[model samples]
Target chain A: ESADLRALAKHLYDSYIKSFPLTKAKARAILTGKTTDKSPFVIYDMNSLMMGEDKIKFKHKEVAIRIFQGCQFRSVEAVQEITEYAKSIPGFVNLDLNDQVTLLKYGVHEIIYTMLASLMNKDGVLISEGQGFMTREFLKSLRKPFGDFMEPKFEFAVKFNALELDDSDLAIFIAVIILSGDRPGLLNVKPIEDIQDNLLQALELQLKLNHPESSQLFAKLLQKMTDLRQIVTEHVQLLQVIKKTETDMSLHPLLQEIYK
Target chain B: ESADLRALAKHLYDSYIKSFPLTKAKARAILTGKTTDKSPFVIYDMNSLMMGEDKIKFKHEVAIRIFQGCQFRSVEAVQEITEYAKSIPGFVNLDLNDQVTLLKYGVHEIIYTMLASLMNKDGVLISEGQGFMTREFLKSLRKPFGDFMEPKFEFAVKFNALELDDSDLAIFIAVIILSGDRPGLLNVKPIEDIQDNLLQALELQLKLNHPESSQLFAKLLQKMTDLRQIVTEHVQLLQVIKKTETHPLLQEIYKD
Candidate 1:
């Protein structure tokens, strides 16, 4: 009977790793931090050789579009992918659809940013999951405050990457983020909270079982969750900035729908 | 005297707009709701149809990158606001520690005021200064966040109604920037002196510029008093999220 929670955790582990964009191979590659033999497609190398052009290009808005658009282009697929994963959670489907939508509405951005740690290392973040590499300096040169926008994600990403969680841990971690009862307008609050507690217990047991030597991992993991929550909070406001600042640019109807 | 203050207001306006990101062209666009043909490049476009799929693919970081950009605003807002804090006439001469303390406590109030620039009774402009968030939408936000929003919106309604120009806002915000009054201060008097000059300068500018509104100066002072209560309520409510975590800039400011 006691082993049932571990079994349930193992069941969750199966679904998480199998979810979209994470094949067994991809999951292992991220866990091991290995890149394929294929040469990295560089998105913006920032013209180390073009010292003469520095005066002109530094003020131009050209490179900013590449980084901004690359990430934005990929977000649609993430929305579809994450929604399915949300659907597959154990008790998630039982909630009223409004409750379900609220969880994803508030929860998806946090989940997406948490997952960002997997795609980034200490220096550059991979755009479109290896379509190209955008170096730290490349992003920072978008001029003054415009370039300043992406820094915080990388700041959190590199720190989050340090946790070195395998797919099992991430799947459990993500499910916890999705099932959180703390978000606004949750009609299924009590039931969702109960499910979350069980999941939390399962996660603690999994952590204990997986890493006998590490005692602080669970507590540290919880703290990182708070950090992710705050990052998501900031994430929406920036979108608000983008919406008002650049209306000519099309916002994904999905994003517009959800944010509104 | 009129020409000197007007020029002072102009310099303040220039720097105020500069310290902010994607300002000027965008600022003018928002102030009067006019779009120029010389459209600047956008930061991101997240819509569908052209949602970047050349029959193309996915991975999770896109939203994270978007989120990354969101958190990115903090660094920009902090850097620009801090720089502007230095530009205030007597602001730099105050004790260095007190300068940090003032920025630490006062920057958000300053931010809330600047946001008032884009706001009106119907809505506020964001998306850089490009999009609109109607009062209904803002009203939809739940709890302590919305609670804080109401007072701020009410304050902005009255504040914007004052029809003070950017120059007026500049000196007024300088007053707010230097008005940090909390625990731990090195030289309180000089800091107060700096804020005092800013207030009088603000009053003088309004008196000269707003010759029609007889009680305008007194009204401005009363609203500033109201502004403090807004920031106070803002800080304490944010304390609820203290454990939930805030931006490092805020964490540093609110640090015990």
Candidate 2:
């Protein structure tokens, strides 16, 4: 009896998905978690039916379980795919002093630019935050690409230093990447689960007030974000570097005057 | 402002179609058609903000109009094609009396067989009320073919003398031709715009009573309705003769 109910539930859930396309039904099972006969699952099942009536109905607990499974798998697949693509760059493997200097000065910008071109041929915005890291870390990671501007003579320092990238430079790079990814013309806008509402609000802010360079940083982010992934097997090297960089950078203060 | 609103409405409607895919948003518009001052034009304007609303905020009237236009054009095309095919049949045109008699009798049997198939197919409980005239006329038409049934014999007698189809047969035949041109399964169980809730009830009934052939009939009806117009158009000459029969007896002997 239990097996029969489970099979029937699976069929209903599958049919419902086929019948109705593209809603929260995608990756549904994962987000809601498993459809076990626990109190939480039962409550969710009843609530969903009550909320949507004919549009969304849960005839049995198994339907809830199916939804939970679908949602989780969807998020997990996207996160994995994103990480795999990020690790493909040769820069992540390690470069010589000259190459490091080049990267510190323009590597991030080059990457962001490459990302922007790659994400296109479709009508939608893309957003990537460096490995789901914090906003400050995210900005700092891009310092190599964009030079500083908050303080006076920041360009002079950027021209001289062949080493560390400044915070203001990182902020500018981050802003540009985000802005390009989210410019208002995206015909379809999908909120990445990790970034969600925050990214949109941030994109709106950059569009309205930020300097062109800051917006460019966001554009770069968006481009990289366009490449969705289903597996993490490919991005191991980039993931390792990103993780290390994030850890190494977290301890540092938000502002450093030097620019590279 | 009106132009801008119209453009926005078009954009919103297109995007909604893309996002939802093949959705019929007409129901929502119908419900609000009379009451809402929020012109469908503006509802689309507000769609971006009300992304989570229940109401379908897109225009689908345009899609329906296009579909209806295509269906009408296709039906005319089918009828014309059938008429030409019938005109070329030798048995139907320039044939001897015996040949005509043979064709008439043979055509009667073939058409009767098809009707019987339809009956067996639809389960003897034929709900196609429009089919009654055609069914009765077919029974009568078959009498000259040689009567296997009383009603068909009576129909043939009446048909030969009066030369006009019985009213029941005429109405049923009209109904069949009226609804015949569509492809099967194209609109069966549409994701939206269901023909009737009775469809589900019929399916349930089939499930409850497990007679395979009858069930098959229900299933076919559920999936598609085959309207055999090719077979029916063959009888139209007979209908023509029935219409012009009074003058034909004297004029046929020596007139050009």
Candidate 3:
């Protein structure tokens, strides 16, 4: 069982979660070199979007446009990651097709939040894979309701980051989140729950072995699921408001599938 | 730095923790096996007390001797745990001896409450190393107290249902033992500061472990307060019995 756990952890990290493996030490040192590091980590420019190697081009009016593009740009990778990651779990792909889609729909955003920890710290989150650094100030500076989009995410990321999860923990945790039986439309809750229980056990033993000093980490991580759920709910609702207002902004069918 | 964040979590668990490298399987395995129970002794199976027992051989009334010896055994673990609490990141910076003040009020509540870990629905693992005291035996003990054991068992049965491993119990114990609202605390602000962070950790933890109940974390938060009531009343029972018994260790820790 543990051998299975080790390989799953490896696959999750190497396959999907290795996007921004920068350590806080490395991230901080790089942050210190902002003047010298002169590459864009990610471009918020919708016209010529990029994640690294230039100064950021910021426009107040384009904030919503750029942010939407950034999310749109990432959602493709996210769908690929989330779907592939879901398929990786033992029984996820075998669940009823509708159930597979439902779990993916509910869990993709939550899983994305978990992924963001790799690229975020208390100050800001790295965007464009690790090329662009987006600060609370930058997000807060967005024109209108766009600014509110990421504030709660920052707060969630900062506290969740304090748990100090590495990729291995993230792998099992992502599996655990995706396998949640409580998701609204599960056809066979027992099998998903059975799978989820095993993932949690894998996660427990993983934390026990690596994070022995952190006695409460498993519980804290579980509670963070609730925290993430609340944040995801609010974030989607706010996007609805923006949807009514920003009618022309791009919403690819792929992103819309997960968002709905 | 992320390293700073990791250190913060480690300090929270290490300083406030009290447990073995043992898991629930190990704990239950050790507790279920038995030895002869000659005259009922109070046993505390702590990690450091690897002798599998304590030797408090006072031949008072059977109930009195058991409770008295239980106090001695509890004190040994309490002193060690109290020493460790000093290691919490900002713990030492508090009024030097308010540490004791914190432990004094918090320890019994922590101990009696978390004792449910070794328990299940049918019986509890009583002391003197190897005695598995049945609920029938304990309920029969006229105020161990009879009512006392039941309420705690009520808690233990439900909490055990959560299936928390030793790691979860360790932090829960720490969270229980450091009460910002405990009477006689010298610095409320600093105590509450520590209290808040621990709650955040435990609350986050419950979410991961118990997905069925978003309300489980708050239910537990309420139980912690409820336990304060139970522990205080248990102390009252101890005092009523203490009027006749001669237990110096109990006197010092439990005396008004």
Candidate 4:
């Protein structure tokens, strides 16, 4: 059956996250509110750089904007990584071209957020590419509109963290979100629904076997998919806001298309 | 294959609403204002009506409360929903057998979303505000059905944030009812088209009525996706309830 394939999916995701583990120093630095140049991710300091709390200085806005763009680019890269992982899944590539694109388009942000949950700590999300930590408080210190974009992710990540899913759980969870049969336009929904149902069954079995004490965790996790959808809606809304507010900023084409 | 049938489906909805004026009022009452006894459904007041918040209620207790008193209400609500669906021109045009099949699968999902529309920031509009069940109260209801209400409340709270008017909801509910992809749908093309046209009307309405943002239309469409997930969760809860306990009325309405 699909149990072996589930293991491969889990194994693939384990190696994926392992490639980008947050260094202990970076995590500590983020928690302590200390900036470290050695970090791979870009962190814009609000307290040190901004002129005043009443109004964000032009330069700080500029820096935050850059950091925002960087975060989005990182999300894009994360999407590509997962898209390739999805391709490796049995029956994924066999889906219609339109269905494939539709699934990835809607599901990529969700997958990124799922992975982001893994790296997230109590304080904020750990940006793997930059090797930097964007603290929750720091993100809030950015300009009015800019700050709004980051909070939803942190909130969602914190709640999602509560699920305590290990890599094996996440592998199937991500697969379930992506292989969703209900993604608007599909040439063939039956196969995809079957795929999603199989993954769901696998997930329920794994949850039972993995965390027997928490009988309700499977249902809770399923509900979390709705939460993820809600968070991503807010994310896309923030992107729309940015598109309207920061006209001069050159949004990545992929981001633009994603929002569009 | 499903697009034009979808258009005719839109007219079908238009004709239905025109027939029943009270339908709109009933829907608006549930979605807005306080929970009133006069309403069609049961409102279990977990915080106020129950003995204490700390005293966790079990599934059978909640089920007895829901099914015992509210059983006929559930059946009546299904009747209304089916009547509304039958009134639709597109649905009426469908084979009688196919029509029943679609109604069986589609009715519960549409009803949940419609109930969601009745939800406010705190909880759903049960008993028209007097029977206002707090989120914690519903969460207190123990496994299966207990776990059921929270996901719905979460979705409804966020969905209510959109502040859609009666007109917007009419189109949205129609779309949910005539969903082309519902399992066992006989002809997907016509249903799909009807859904598409309804969406177009929804998009246009959002623009005209709430023109401030471009994302509003897309966001409303996006809520449908969220609705789909919420209904899925609802179905799961129903399945669990069906397995453990049986209410003849519930069994009749929600035949597996």
Candidate 5:
């Protein structure tokens, strides 16, 4: 809701960065996937540290996410082509002129997928045994099955930096999330908040008993899986609510909570 | 006539492997575009180095050359996606055994594109930007018309190492030029003569301009560009030929 999802993901990411603080040289290496140790994950966050008039830094991180979704032939070339493709999508092109200008500078979720896929390939999970595992198969296995539908929609929910450099970047990021197609129809319940809570609680439990790092990370992942379930249930419920009431008032409770 | 484009391209690549005998680690970094300092740019020769699995090695100057006619995309992911989509037309479900098998091991061009597009939200140029650019104002600033074909295809001419283990690596490398997709097309040339010509030409080029490192590498890139253009022209001509052929020949060509 709002761009809070993006902000939260970025907040968690920023927290990770403050803990790690990477060099530009190291950032390039991480971006390029030459290194895999999570120790250097802070490189992409150094944009705030820019010294000069470089309003636009390298866009690969953001662009690569959306580009990967475009179905580019190679892991490396998605960002360039899909950005060009996004311009042609009808509603996208029709966005106010100012929106178009900001979208131009921002990369979307698809590009991020591209980078992740590249990381997967290099990590030897997808690209193992000389020929990598199929992307679709790999993703399918990774997907959390919510309900039986003609076609299941997908959305990536991660907390990211919500603060915008300008109105345009904010608009595009918000617009793209709505357009991601796979998003669950839930509105009020802040599933991610529940998710992070469950995660930290489980971690606290494990830490109290002296669990290993792998156990903690796995528990965090399991909490994310549970978050997916609650989100899907909310989606179906929201659909029913919308069908039952023509008015948008059904979401009043959620809206009130947000206001509070 | 065959995928000799790959053969020629790989031959050119292998020539670099022979010419420079730097450590495999350093040489690989240079070609992969990982390291951008002088180490990657430093010069080396083919005849001056020792080659083997493990030993003191010299430098071999392998490089990748993408071309002018092959339109530049903003990201390599786009190029791969576009190519993959182009390769498979119509449709088939991913669950099919053949499709599944190919999907896993074969890093087909389109598969990469789909994955990349999933991450990035950039509107595709062909899908979205093309429409926007169709505006009269935008058209006014455009370049002159070039190829007149109603539908033009773009191809990527890339050089990559055959994914083979050490024991079989040399075997695959040795056979790949003749058999692999050179420029991503099937090869059907007069093999004996083509191999001889390619090998001889590589040796001649290596000797003619003694390696100046970066200059030689640049020249090699230019040569690859030339080769890609030649193959693309031939492909376009073949397409036209298929279109204009008599009904009987058409039947023969399309026979499954």
Candidate 6:
């Protein structure tokens, strides 16, 4: 029961994360915690970075709006990929349609942030598609309230990367997120919970097999799930700000549907 | 089975909308399309309300509007949500305290979700949307609360984007009301089973009525989590307000 399924999970993870590779500049930004002034991607403008009553000028409004859209584009693309991966899992599609979306809505953000782990060094994550690097310092420099958005993810990612999990472990971890049974509106809790239990067993066994010396790897990885929740919650708050203020900037239709 | 469920859903929706009595001031304000001195509730103090660089004043102002906004709106919403829950097929069969427990935790969440129904990209429609809360107006409200209106609008726009009818909303509200995952529920299995049957009925209705997109049902289910997040943030804001400035109404609804 376990042998073939474990390999299958690892194969699924490899193809999905590897399929979308960041550009060299993006990769370097991830490696080093800073971006050059000439960087192609503008994460945030110097002015209008803070969330306050200060009047945002037309030019800065455009810059802030673009950065928000860029972030959404990256997030939406990953959600599409995650949706595809869920469809490939053997019994995932057979579950109630309501249950399927419920799982995806709650789980997709965690998988996206988890996948961001591969690009992580000690500093911060590289924004895909050459959108410069997002370091703790860069995020901190932004205005209060606005800058608060990315702070949680950086805090969580630094500790998660310290566990040194390889791709095999990540594959099962992603599955564990998608297969979660406790999501709010699930119609088939028993079946989904059983699937999640099996994934948990496989994940534990894989950690034992892959990292023989690290006894606490599985436990620490499990702890990261709560951290992922906090980050995604913060991310949603930021998304709400952008959606309300930048009415001129358009969000992708799929993202607009999925984000809230 | 289908006929019984259909009637139940309609009755639920009808009773929900009719339960609350709008104050005379609110009704006239809606009719006149202006906030007069006679208006019972303070939507926002226009003269004093402006977003300034003063972070301290800004925070206090936002917190007050939310506290005031929620207080003005919450009482009627709680009544409607509670009455609607009682009308669902198997909802009242749960223990009496369990019924209260479900309503207590679930009411505010349902209230916000319903608020989303009246929302556009601009803001929600108060007094059956006769009075509009603009996005700029809401943003002027500040942290936590200023940040609050956008997510509700986002969820509402996307959810309303699904084009669900009134019947669809009634059932969705019921499912939200009878949340099996609520913290202190005495019975999980039975309540979850009720929700499951409701989901099945809702899916069938959507398929029969709107055959074009089979994914519509799934999309509706996905929205529940978004609703939960909004309510959670609302609760967090309430907690902060409770710590510094106390209001009896807020303390009563958010009593934890």
- How do the residues A122-145 of candidate 2 rate in per-residue lDDT, one tens digit apiece? 111111211111111222222332
Q: Candidate 3: misplaced stretches above 4 Å?
A: A1-61, B1-256
TM-scores of the candidates are 0.49, 0.16, 0.50, 0.48, 0.21, 0.47
For B1-256, candidate 5 gives per-residue lDDT tens digits of: 3354334545434533443233223323433335556322111222211122123221111111111112223233333323332222111322234333332222222222122211112111121111111112222221222221111112211122111112122212222133212322222233323333443333334333344321222222222322323344545544554453324753453332
lDDT tens digits by residue: candidate 6, A162-233: 777776677677877898765877787878866765667677678878898764455446645756776787
lDDT (tens digit, per residue) of candidate 3 on A178-214: 8866577668787876776667667767787889877
Interface RMSD after interface superposition, each candidate:
22.7, 24.0, 9.3, 13.5, 24.5, 12.6
| Model 1 ranges off by over 4 Å | A23-39, A44-62, A143-146, B1-233, B236-256
| Best-first order by TM-score | 3, 1, 4, 6, 5, 2
List DockQ, one per candidate, in order.
Answer: 0.01, 0.00, 0.03, 0.04, 0.01, 0.02
Label model 4 with its docking quality class. Answer: incorrect
Best by TM-score: 3
Each prediction's RMSD over C-alphas, in Å, is 22.9, 33.0, 14.8, 21.5, 24.7, 17.5
* Highest-scoring model, DockQ: 4
Q: Residue A235 CA error for candidate 3 (Å)?
A: 0.7
Residue A64, model 2: Cα distance from true site in angstroms: 51
Give the worst 10-residue stretch by lDDT in candidate 3 chain A.
Answer: A51-60
TM-score of candidate 6 against the unseen true structure: 0.47
Tell me how far the alpha carbon of residue A34 in candidate 5 is from the true structure, in angstroms, after superposition. 14
lDDT of 1 by residue, B1-256 (tens): 5566566667777777776664433554654555564332222334421343233232222432332332345445777889887777777888888888888777667766766776767665544654444555445444534454566677787677777777777777787776635458788878766665565567678878888765455446545545656776676765674533335665464243
